[PDB]
Subunit: 115 residues, 3 copies
């Protein structure tokens, strides 16, 4: 709650310096969850293909306890695709984002679960 | 839409030229979705174990908006273990494939989500 | 059934050598499944942040055909958090574990599914 992972074939070097921070701040506002509970993971240099091609692309995941749904998913997308296009230079139609509404009894953290 | 990921301890150098393409082509045929929508991600050189042994193995996942189900999963398994076995030399009883039927509102793409 | 993945920013060199075996034996006991069926994947050196900081952290997931539940999970979290803290020196509050109960029809293995 929330975890954001980005897998992309864009090279390490193109990942901008405060990128993780940025994501964190942004996700913080978008979901309205406090930053310290936000986890962010970026994996560049991957061997991937999208629609058969090797041009820049990304497969992402957003996990959260609640705050996932129809319209919300639409804003996250915008926001997220927006950042990726902008920072990593990836075309949005070359991005997929999987959204997962996690149940609290199913998220372990510090010796227990959120249930 | 679909996204297929392969995580394996086989070395990068062992992945044949052409593999990403073959996978995109076979999955398109297998799920009946145009290739344009298929994303493929191969991750070699992983630190992994299956059954406590570090002989060659793989953990994969296939996510799709529909085209997932009892009989379909069975054929994807036959298809996919067959390729990993022939192209990557991984024994099929050392492979796990997780299948996810995704809901359209939960797949972000191109600044929005599907429907 | 079961598959355990750990993604962490700790360096590869800090991952003990019997770590995969250790996790394997411990999950076999915790889940009550024979070790033969346990898959473990450890991914160090990742680019991640937790709560905005880059101190050591881990994003994990545990997939099982059954044995997943409110209480089991609480117990798993303790075991897992204990292991990561001792072996990788990760602080338990900088760890998330996603729990997934999978349907047998959704898990491929050895050319077919468990269904």
């Amino acid at each position: 709650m929330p975890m954001f992972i980005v897998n992309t074939n864009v090279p390490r070097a193109s990942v901008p310096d405060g990128f993780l921070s940025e994501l964190t701040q942004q996700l913080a506002q978008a979901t309205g969850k406090p930053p310290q509970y936000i986890a962010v993971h970026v994996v560049p240099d991957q061997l991937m293909a999208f629609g058969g091609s090797s041009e820049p692309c990304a497969l992402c995941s957003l996990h959260s306890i609640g705050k996932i749904g129809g319209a919300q998913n639409r804003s996250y997308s915008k926001l997220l695709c927006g950042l990726l296009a902008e920072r990593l230079r990836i075309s949005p139609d070359r991005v997929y984002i999987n959204y997962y509404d996690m149940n609290a009894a199913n998220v372990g953290w510090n010796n227990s679960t959120f249930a």
